[PDB]
Every structure is written in C-alpha cells, then in structure tokens.
Design a binder for this molecule. Structure first.
Ligand SMILES: Cc1ncc(C[n+]2csc(CCOP(=O)(O)OP(=O)(O)O)c2C)c(N)n1
Ligand SMILES: Cc1ncc(C[n+]2csc(CCOP(=O)(O)OP(=O)(O)O)c2C)c(N)n1
Ligand SMILES: [Ca+2]
Ligand SMILES: [Ca+2]
Lengths: 806, 415
C-alpha cells in the first residue's frame, strides 16, 4: 500500500519567515534563468565574456508562456514542503512547461543524482542547457525522463483525473494539481472537477487544484479568464470547491510583496486543508468544500513587455518563445541578453557555476523532495498482489462433462476471482467502471467492498452497495475511469477497469499516452521502476450488441492497440478470452504483469466452456494452440482445412462449423488464438510464435479459415510475412448489424456457423460440395426468416451443444 | 509627439513624511504672503521699520478669495510631484487667482530664470510685489506671461475641456484641473465633465478634476455648495467619477492636522489613479470611474474673519479684496499689517530677503517643476508635421478639360 511519508496535514502556527521568502524569490529567479537557458543557449551558460549570438541554439524549441508561472508555484510549493514535511506530488497540467520541471529537479539535486553527467557546476550547466529539446538530449515536456513527473501533460485534460487517482487510498498524500486555463476548456478536464464527490478525506489524500489562469492558450484568450469573476467563483463553488484567488504581476508591485502575499494565502489554504483532514478523523460522512486556487498572473510573466511593438508579457504571444530568433539579429540578441540579465545571475551562481547555498537553503531534503518522492516513482512502492489460488475458480465441469459444456457467463468467474484479490489486497486494488461494473458482471466484489460515493445518500431502497469509502469507483466518464486508474498504478497500486467494447474508443488517446509513457520507460528510463499493468476488461462486445444495435458495434480497440507494438517493448497485451477458464489464465497473467496495457476481451453472455484451466494455461503460454481433441485430422498432411478462431463468439461458430464438417466426413484441424500478438512477425516480436511453431499450428499449405472477433484487417496486417499467409481467409466484423438476434449478428458479418461451414467446403472443393453449399446458404436465409417470424433464433442455432459434451 | 517625462503613475508605498508636510505648510504661508504682497504692497515687502501706509498700492487690483485655496492645493501638488516624479500640468480654472500662479513660479525658481530682473532677494521681492496688476507690470490673471500657465481662465468654463485636450495622446501626463464652483455653473464647464467618456486610460493621460468648492462666486453662493452632499456626490458619480470630499478650515483644526489629512487623501486618490493606469495596460475596454476631488474650504481662507463687522472669510466678500483700502485709514492699515504678520514672514525669509531653504526643500526640480514642464510651453515639444506631397491630391481635370470643370465636393479633397 502507500507509504505514510513525512508529517502530514500539519499547520505552521507561525508566519512564513522572511528568510524563506528570500529563498523563494531567488528560486524563482534562478529557475527562470535556467528555464530560459534550456530554451535559448547551446553554450556559455553564465554569459562569460564574450556572450555572442553563437551561444544561441540554432532552433528554438520549447514553451516560455506557462513556465515563469510554474516556477513561481513550484518555488512556493518547495518552501511549503520543507516547512511542513508534507508528502507532496505535483501534477503539472501544462506539461509543455518542461523547463520548470527539469529546473526543479536540477535545483533540488535529484537531476545530478539521476543523471551523473549533468553536474552542479558550469560545465554541467552547459550540458543542462544544450540537452533540452535537442537532438540526443531530453524532451520538451515534463516527460517520464524527469524526476518528479507522473504526468507528461502533452495531451491536455487529464491533470485532475490523475491528481485524484494519485490520492486514492493515499491518506498522507497532498497533490497540488496545476491546471492550464486552456486545458480547463477540454472535455476530460471539465468533468475532472467533479472527482471530489468520489474521494473521502479520511481514507484518501487531498488534491488542491490550481487554475493557472494566465489568460491565454496558444493564440486565443481563455474562456475562464474572460468571464466575470463572480461567474468564475460561482462555477467552482458549484463543483464543491471553496475558491481562493491570487492576482499578481499586472502592476508594479515589487516581487517581495508578491511572495509575502502568496505565502500568506498559501498558508490560509493549507490551514483549511488541515482542518478538513482533522475533521475527517471524526466525521467523514459529510463532504467538505475543498479549497482551490485561482492563480491569475500574466502569461510569460517577467519576459520583456513588448518585443517589436507587440505585447508579449500577458499575451498568447509569449506561448512558445517570446523572442523568436535571437540568433539572427543583433537587436533580438540584445533583447535576449537583457532578459537573461534581468534575473541577475551573478547573485545566483558562484564562481564555479554552482547555484549558491542561500538560493536553495529553504528547499526540502530527502524523500520529501519533488523528484525523490516515491509516489512520483511508484514502481518503488509497488509489491506483487497476494493472489488467490486460481484452481478455486476453475470451471471444473469441462473435465466432468466434456469440452463445450454449459452456459456460463465467463466474466462472473473473473468477478469472483477479483473479489478475493480485493479481499486479500486491501487498499491496494481498485475497480473502476463507467457505471458498468454490475452490467459487465463484476459485482461479486460488493460482497467484500463498496462503491465509493461521497455525494448525498437518500435511501436504502436505491443506495445499495455504496459507502463513503470503498474499492470500486463509478462515474459515467471513461476519461475519469481510465485516468483514475492510470494514476493509481503510477503511484504503486493495482487494479482493473471494465468497459463496453465500443466505448473504449472514448479513451483511445489516453491509452496512447499511457503507452508512450510505458514505451519511453522500458526503452530508456531504468531508474523508473515497473508499475502494475493497466488492465482493461473489454466486455459486452460487438457480437452480443444486438440489443443496442448498430451504432454500439465497434470492436476497433484492437487496431488501436496494435499500433503500440514495436521494437520489443512488450507494453501491450491483447487477449481473447475463449471461455471462463481462459479468462482466469489471462487475468492471472495480467494481474502479475508490470509495465503493460492489457486488453482482455471477454464475453459476458452465456456461452460454452471449451478448455480446462490446465489446457488454458498451455494455450496462453504460446498464445495460440491446436485443439487436437477437436480436430479430425490427425496430423498436418491429412488436414484439408484449418479452422482457427480468436474470441468466444468466433470460437462458438467455428466449433459449430466443425461439427457440421465432421458430419460430412471432412478432415480438419481446429486452432484457437488466445493472444493476438503471438501471430506478429517473429522478426518484429521475440515473444511471438516462431515461424516453425506457426507452421506447425497453422500448416505449411492448407487453407486456413480464420474467424476473428474484430476487423479482419488486424489479422491480415499482422500475418503479412508468416508462412502460408496467402491461404488465410479471415472473417471478422464487417460493419454490419442492427438491433437483432445473436444469430443475425453473426450472419450479416459472414461468421455464422453455416457460412463458415460453407466457406470451408469452398476452400476444400467448391464443386463436389456444391449441393451441400447451396443447402447451407438456403438455411441461413431460413434461420433469419425464423427469427423475423417468431421473435427468437432458430432451434438449430440456439439448442446446439458440441458433440464432445457427454 | 508628447515626451514621456518622469516616472509616471507610481505609488508612494509609504506615508507622506512629516518633514515634507512642514515644507507644504511653509509653502502655503509664504505663497499666501507673496500673494498678499502682490495685491497690496508697492514698497517695503518684508515690512521693515517703518512699514506705513505709503507702502500700500494706491489702487488695489486682484483677487484674494480663490487664492489661499489655490496656494494650498499648489503646495500639496508640488510635494506630490517631487515625491513621485510625476509629469504634471495644472489647469487653474479660477484664473483670477493670478497671485497663486506667479507666487508658484517665484517659489519654484522659474520666475527669476524667465524674468532675470525679479531676483530672489529683497529688491527682487519689491519688484515682484509692485509689478502685479500695475501699469507696466504683469497681468491680474494666470496669463501666458506666467511660467506654467496654458490657460488664463479669465473667461470661465473651459478648464475641463482644456484639461482633457491636454492629456489626449499624452499617456504620461497628469492634469489636476481646478474648477471654480461658480465656474461649474457655466454651460461649457457643465458639459466638460462628460469628457471622461471620450478619453482612454491607456492611450491618454489622466485628469483629476478638483472642484474648488469655496461656497461663493462674486456676490452669490454657488449652487453646488448649497445642494445636499448626497445630491453633489450622486451628480459626480452619475458623470463617471468617483468623488472624494475634503473639508477644511471651518473649525479650529490646526494647520498641520489639515495638511496630514489632505496628504493622506491625496495619496489615496493617487493610488486609485495608479490602479486605473496599471489596469489599462491590460484592459482599456472598460471605462473606469475616475477620481475627482471636492475641495470644500472657506472662501478667502486665512483672511481676517470679520472686517468692519462683515463676515469676510467664508464669504463672497473676500472675492476681490477683503480689505478695501488699507491706504486710507489707520484702522484698515492695521488690519492689513496684522494679516501680513499672521503668516510670520520672519520665519519664511532670511536676512537678505530670499525665501529660506527649508521652505522649499520639498519642491520638485528641473523639468518636473510646474513652470518648467514642457507641456506648459508646448511650442518646445512641437515639430513640423510630415506632410504628404500636395500634388497627389490635386484635381488634375482643370488642366485636361478647362477651368470650371466638374462637380466635385471640395472638402472631400481636404479629407
Ligand atoms: C488535447 C490537446 N489539444 C491541443 C493541444 C495543443 N496545445 C498545447 S499548449 C496548448 C495551450 C495550452 O493552454 P493552457 O492550458 O492555457 O496552457 P499554458 O498557458 O499554461 O501554457 C494547446 C492548445 C494539446 N496540448 N492538447
Ligand atoms: C464667462 C464668465 N462670466 C463672468 C465672469 C466674471 N467672474 C469672475 S470670477 C467670477 C466668480 C468665479 O467663481 P468661482 O468659479 O466660484 O471662483 P472663485 O471663487 O474660486 O474665486 C465671475 C462671475 C467670468 N470670469 N467669466
Ligand atoms: Ca493558459
Ligand atoms: Ca468659488
């Protein structure tokens, strides 16, 4: 679970010392200098004679506009941390404020600790400035390469979901969450403000949202800075916050008055938070209004007010670089030089180029430093789950009665397994869902926990399984669920969320950003320890969406996740749960895995159970497997056709087609694919099937009929250099469907058992089986006409049991 | 264009120093003395033994009533200017307060600079007093002959139009505009209050209107001083001003409390103006309420309260001269002598007749002085226009077709 770090929720009981404020003001100057040096300078960091245009980088990359505001806030937060011993993680929402994050880590000493070539002297400072956003250096954003980041904030709008995920079951953790005022215009951010209705001030930590109201986004004003101050305050009060406003930099107040004013307001806010935390030790049934800070400052604060007659400080014109080419004109170089000198670096750095002791003597030390807090490197906190014994949940009836027995709902099995994970791993495992946990049949967890709800309660007739604390969280937002879980994992804990398949697409871009985090971490950031995997139960899938119908039918999550499978990163798992015993085997592998995004595509409809758990574990280790108990070919040369399937509904239709083929005497081989990346090119993926293993399973030369759960294009693209790939005939979802019966869903997508039987006969000999082929096609129209007439599927479809069942 | 002068729109961020206030109080005493000397005295400016009726001018010309109020305001404005380095031009609306304007220029040193015969000693002081409103001397009003004037204010009612014209495209310029409360009865003044709807606080300067509410015009009370204080405040708030009122001289408050009270109110007003100017660097789309000062003081303030049983201080009777002939009666000469002595000139002037250093050590210096500000001598700022080539606009068709061609509208060409 989360470590208790420091002395949390302590009031100061004194004014902020004038010396500490003198520290904060020097911090802001030197962090601003170091932010500018990283953007503009390739050499001569301390502007020794001669400082000329040759010291300027040839291409200016990075963002000034948000940066001096972030440096201000970070300076004051560091003072706060050292004075109070508070366990603190910052969410840097305007993540293009990269130079502030790297400057912080350089000043707190964690940068040189982590990156020993970047020393705390003039040659290390030169390397520090050149490397920023440079070929072979470090990124422009607050990337996972930076000590202290758990959030790159490249794609905007997840700051608050990540902040609130971080503090769940983390009652000593304080998260100051800096939100762009442009970022506050996004969808995901806008709903993220309501997360305070889903956290509990006793059992969870505290988020302080900080609205970086600098007035501007890239080229536009921001909505929230142009509405009235009364509207802006009512808005935050309507969302359960008590808003405080700070305004600075729009007049000629000296910088030391600003710092005193801010430290006074910070400590007032903090006294309000400590009151909330102290009250919650007794009463955590009544939701407080949490503080939030509206930080109103000019964009690009302390850049030159006018460059070439255009307003730059307090404008969108300061967003990227205020000064656009200091290398090309003497005039613009002089502006850069005077700007760099306005921070007076001669007082900041000593003769050797180290930042002076009195600049940083207010800073926190040890694990309380922003770049050294374990919650910001949450792999160091994370332990293996205590997992229950997987055979306790095994469907034993396959071994009793035969492969293909029963009408179980496979996700109920996962639900019972996850219930006992939650029971064995209190405060360490969570379930998230967008109001779909019961619907996706995971509600056995309510026997051991509750849905965390901190809005109002009204009646025990409606409010079952809800409590102000609990390990299940539901809000109708895929962005919230994915974002909560992502930060729960990045801070060292574990979990799962579930979703209807077609709505996974809502967070495709969040999955992309989590995968780029993971890809960069496993390629090049070894000091960042492995975090628990992002586990996604994909249920209510396309084949059993014949009640919501056509516009809820999109299995396309698989195509998205296949674009993050390169260079042996192995950060993606794509798993088709064939039945409940395969779902168990998959779930245990995903629950033991680290540094991944695991998609688990499982049906929740009643379906057969095909495998025992020991067979499921064997198929899962390779990824695909022949089912010799289902083949009537007895090796690869007497097979006429290979019937392969990936997914539970393709497996059902292929197994029903193999029974009709067997009745015709045909010699075939049956294959199941549980793990989709096992089919990936053996050159590209060293966990995938070797080409010899692939040709034993599939064959060297026989026609393979392949029923696939998602778009056939996924498979055709993956097997492009596999042996015998020209003989594959992939059937997937093909954008057909309506609100209809289950048979009609498989029929219109050409994956029903009769079409698959017919396709196998056309592949074997379309001419000797011509009579029986015309017979199967006529039945397809007749079983559809039955559904229209009677209101339910034809009994040859619905009553079918595999012949292996005794 | 207009020069940026000084350090405009700067807050003080400290109380006004007690020493500067002692400066302002000595300024007011000596400017009042020098105003009276200019009206009454033809000789013996420092009343050396013997000071007799022969030293009194044969004909008394000029205006006392507005003057000590103007000297008060001007003293405090000079302190303000030296403390803040503000570019400042004064519009003296009651322009018949001539002696205040000449006294200011004599005290700030610009008079002797401009008029080398009027030296800063006892013989220059004698010439200074005799010349005022005298045959072959200088005028009764705040005439163009005075350093610091851009507005004679003889004919009343243009103070605010001139104040607001001055600050247009002049974003560093502060104009304290002193308005007579009788002058506020005129047509042109009454509409001049709305000019704040035609200026922009970023691109233009700032006018502070100062209503010299002394209660009286020549022989009548003033409308604005006889309506209720609630009506008077609503009026200014209706015209886009935030009014501040100062009241002094109608009780026995010592003069040093008055100065402290005033300097506190002045700096509060000025902090409001600096806020307006600082806001306008970001938002100049929303019109602020500008401050204005209602300055309520007795007319003729510090003249003898009663002359011959008639109320003189705080009356229209102090408008021209409180004392009507100090040359004709021993009784009236003694009133003038005691009046002149009430300012205690022995502490103001040294043995040679120069105003003492500690009287004027609070004063502004250089181009920030009222009589040396280039905006008050604007010919020094002015350059030739860049004019476009006149043949580009010539109607060429006379030469083509003949004299008398066309149906042009001549003013479109000028346009
Ligand atoms: C989802 C998304 N769309 C567009 C962008 C491009 N972008 C980067 S910075 C930025 C402006 C950000 O504004 P704010 O949130 O206002 O940031 P800050 O001012 O503090 O720089 C935008 C639009 C983005 N980062 N994310
Ligand atoms: C248009 C116009 N009409 C008449 C006069 C005559 N006049 C001179 S001073 C004066 C009284 C001015 O009153 P106020 O404005 O009240 O001046 P202050 O009291 O400050 O002396 C008048 C009526 C004038 N100057 N201008
Ligand atoms: Ca912004
Ligand atoms: Ca008057």
């Amino acid at each position: 679970t989360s470590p208790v770090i420091g002395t949390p929720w302590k009031k100061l009981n004194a004014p902020v010392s004038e010396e500490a404020l003198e520290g904060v003001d020097k911090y802001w100057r030197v962090a601003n200098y170091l932010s500018i040096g990283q953007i503009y300078l390739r050499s001569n960091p301390l502007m020794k004679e001669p400082f000329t245009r040759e010291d300027v980088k040839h291409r200016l990359v990075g963002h000034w506009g948000t940066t001096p505001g972030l440096n201000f806030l970070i300076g004051h937060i560091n003072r706060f941390i050292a004075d109070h011993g508070q366990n603190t993680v910052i969410i840097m929402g305007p993540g293009h404020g990269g130079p502030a994050g790297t400057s912080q880590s350089y000043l707190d000493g964690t940068y040189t600790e982590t990156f020993p070539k970047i020393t705390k002297d003039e040659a290390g400072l030169q390397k520090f400035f050149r490397q920023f956003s440079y070929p072979g250096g470090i990124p422009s954003h607050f990337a996972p390469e930076t000590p202290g980041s758990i959030h790159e904030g490249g794609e905007l709008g997840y700051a608050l979901s990540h902040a609130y995920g971080a503090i769940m079951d983390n009652p000593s953790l304080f998260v100051p969450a800096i939100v762009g005022d442009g970022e506050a215009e996004t969808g995901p951010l806008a709903t993220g403000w309501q997360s305070n209705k889903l956290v509990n001030p006793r059992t969870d930590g505290i988020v302080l949202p900080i609205l970086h109201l600098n007035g501007y986004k890239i080229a536009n004003p921001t909505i929230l800075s142009r509405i009235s101050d009364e509207e802006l305050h009512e808005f935050f009060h309507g969302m359960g916050y008590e808003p405080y406003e700070f305004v600075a930099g729009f007049d000629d107040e000296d910088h030391m008055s600003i710092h005193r004013r801010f430290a006074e307001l910070w400590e007032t806010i903090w006294d309000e938070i400590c009151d909330i935390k102290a009250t919650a030790q007794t009463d955590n049934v009544h939701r407080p209004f949490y503080p939030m800070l509206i930080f109103r400052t000019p964009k690009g604060w302390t850049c030159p007010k006018y460059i070439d007659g255009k307003k730059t400080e307090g404008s969108w014109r300061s967003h990227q670089v205020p000064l656009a080419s200091a290398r090309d004109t003497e005039a613009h170089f002089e502006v850069l030089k005077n700007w760099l000198e306005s921070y007076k670096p001669e007082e900041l750095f000593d003769a050797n180029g180290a930042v002076k002791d009195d600049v940083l003597a207010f800073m926190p030390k040890g694990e309380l430093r922003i770049g050294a807090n374990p919650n910001a490197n949450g792999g160091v906190i994370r332990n293996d789950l205590k997992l229950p014994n997987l055979e306790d949940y095994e469907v034993k009836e396959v071994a009793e009665y035969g492969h293909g027995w029963g009408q179980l709902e496979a996700t109920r099995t996962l639900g019972a397994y996850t219930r006992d994970i939650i029971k064995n791993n209190p405060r360490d495992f969570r379930i998230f869902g967008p109001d779909e946990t019961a619907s996706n049949r995971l509600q056995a967890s309510y026997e051991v926990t509750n849905k965390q709800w901190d809005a109002g309660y009204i009646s025990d007739e409606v409010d079952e399984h809800m409590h102000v604390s609990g390990q299940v969280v539901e809000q109708l937002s895929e962005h919230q669920m994915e974002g909560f879980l992502e930060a729960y994992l990045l801070t060292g804990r574990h979990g799962i969320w579930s979703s209807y398949e077609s709505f996974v697409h809502v967070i495709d871009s969040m999955l992309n950003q989590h995968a780029k985090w993971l890809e960069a971490t496993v390629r090049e950031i070894p000091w960042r320890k492995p975090i628990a995997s992002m586990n996604l139960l994909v249920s209510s899938h396309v084949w059993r969406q014949d009640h919501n119908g056509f516009s809820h039918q999109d299995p396309g999550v698989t195509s998205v996740l296949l674009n993050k499978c390169f260079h042996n990163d192995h950060v993606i798992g794509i798993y088709f749960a064939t039945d409940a015993n395969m779902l168990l085997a998959i779930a245990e592998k995903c629950y033991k895995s680290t540094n991944k995004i695991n998609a688990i595509i499982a049906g929740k409809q009643p379906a057969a159970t095909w495998l025992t758990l020991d067979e499921a574990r064997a198929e899962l280790e390779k990824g695909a497997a022949a089912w010799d108990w289902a083949s009537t070919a007895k090796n690869n040369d007497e097979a006429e056709v290979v019937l392969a399937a990936a997914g539970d509904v393709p497996t059902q239709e292929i197994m029903a087609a193999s029974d009709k083929l067997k009745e015709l005497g045909v010699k075939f081989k049956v294959v199941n694919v549980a793990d989709l990346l096992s089919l990936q090119s053996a050159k590209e993926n060293d966990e995938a099937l070797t080409d010899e293993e692939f040709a034993d399973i599939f064959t060297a030369d026989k026609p393979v009929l392949f029923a696939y759960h998602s778009y056939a294009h996924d498979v055709r693209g993956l097997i492009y250099d596999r042996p015998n790939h020209d003989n594959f005939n992939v059937h997937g979802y093909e954008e057909e469907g309506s609100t209809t019966t289950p048979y009609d869903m498989v029929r219109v997508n050409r994956i029903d058992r009769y079409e698959l039987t017919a396709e196998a006969l056309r592949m074997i000999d379309a001419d000797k089986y011509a009579d029986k082929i015309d017979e199967l096609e006529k039945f397809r129209d007749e079983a559809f006409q039955f559904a229209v007439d009677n209101g339910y599927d034809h009994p040859d479809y619905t009553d079918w049991v595999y012949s292996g069942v005794n």
